[PDB]
Amino acid sequence: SMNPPPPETSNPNKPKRQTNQLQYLLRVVLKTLWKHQFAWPFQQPVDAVKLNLPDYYKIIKTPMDMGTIKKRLENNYYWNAQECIQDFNTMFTNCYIYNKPGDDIVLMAEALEKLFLQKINELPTEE
Ligand SMILES: Cc1cnc(Nc2ccc(N3CCN(C)CC3)c(F)c2)nc1Nc1ccc(Cl)c(NS(=O)(=O)C(C)(C)C)c1
Numbered sequence: 001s002m003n004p005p006p007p008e009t010s011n012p013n014k015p016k017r018q019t020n021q022l023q024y025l026l027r028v029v030l031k032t033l034w035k036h037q038f039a040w041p042f043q044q045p046v047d048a049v050k051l052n053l054p055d056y057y058k059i060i061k062t063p064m065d066m067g068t069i070k071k072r073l074e075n076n077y078y079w080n081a082q083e084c085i086q087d088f089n090t091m092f093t094n095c096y097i098y099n100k101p102g103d104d105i106v107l108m109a110e111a112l113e114k115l116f117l118q119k120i121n122e123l124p125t126e127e
Helices: 020-034 066-074 081-098 104-120
Strands: none
Touching: 020 066, 020 081, 020 104, 066 081, 081 104
8 A cells, every 4th residue: 555665766877967858857748747737647656545546556656756757857867868768658558557448537538649740750869
């Protein structure tokens, strides 16, 4: 029933970079999704205690959320764009794994994912 610690957002020994693609992922992709009317359920780790979902972290073994992504981007935690893109995809996929088609939370994820895909279609070439 208990919540796990959140995903790591700081690790001094992890090699990391700031690339133009990672800057786009913060300034365009994260910013666009974060301001969306459906962002709020995804802006922090799921509190499975307060939502009374004792099975949540028993089923979702690789949790991810945009609060964590935002911190990772702000801290320049990533090595490359694909690592960050993977975090977004994990977040969406986790939603579809845990919930049912047509559930409000799924509709919310689908709207965010549509925008995500539109923005990453225009990811700049690495300079
Ligand atoms: C990211 C994420 C992924 N998956 C889920 N699943 C989920 C499934 C069932 C429920 N409940 C169904 C109704 N019960 C009375 C309480 C439990 C739930 F709260 C969440 N939750 C997520 N975040 C999240 C964050 C905060 C809120 Cl308040 C919501 N609630 S909600 O999904 O019902 C909605 C956003 C539509 C109000 C979800």
